[PDB]
Amino acid sequence: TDFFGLTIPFMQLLGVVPEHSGNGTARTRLPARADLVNSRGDIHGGTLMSVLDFTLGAAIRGDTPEVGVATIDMNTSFMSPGRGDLVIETRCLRRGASIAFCEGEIRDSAGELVAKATATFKII
Template sequence: MLSNDDARSWLVNVFTNLNFNKNLGLKITVCEANKAEIRFVWDDKLMGNPMQKILHGGVTASALDTVGGILAIFSRMEKMHFEDSAALIEFTKKVGTIDLRTDYLRPGRGDEFIATAQLIRSGSRVCVTRMELHNQKGDQIAFGTGTYLVG
């Protein structure tokens, strides 16, 4: 039987090594059953508007979706027991975003960005999270709500 810590470590490793997440520079900094946080630093390749030097809206939405998905998976994993890594892999194959709403509040300016997620509901098949994106000064750039299939 895999421990929750082993399952969590495996999943953090998977998220960290996804090429898309690596291209965005996403790093998981908090990973708990009720809260998740990722951070990334400004890079010109993330720019959506070169005249204003702000984040691309897709980067903002991707960061929110990623942190919401991480929280949904971890909150569900806390209630499960995996016999081995094969069972954990089968579980993660069934996870996906059902719905994502992103509200852009101000231009994405900053040197570092912090995306956080809080759990709204965790069921046996569906989880709902609320996410926020701030810069290093604490300016809120966007918030969102995500619904995720987890079972």
């Protein structure tokens, strides 16, 4: 599978679908699967942090795909339980020669806020 110009075994396991990236943003979609679920039947937070990580970075190497990106730190807030196909949109807040700052949110089909995250990246 092609994830924004890169192969990623774990993202292929999660079945996430890359939709867009460019102009400092990126959009990913997470289809529902009983595999990715919580102990309460909700989409596991780990699952959300995974696709969010992917998407967060893609908002950097979408304006510049020749660039290498590595997550330094990432903060996630879980607002409400995720269920059914989700959509992840991220946005790059500031980009430098070495460091880039990003953010994003996960929303359900009903447009409600499932989770929000912000991260720091090392631009290789």
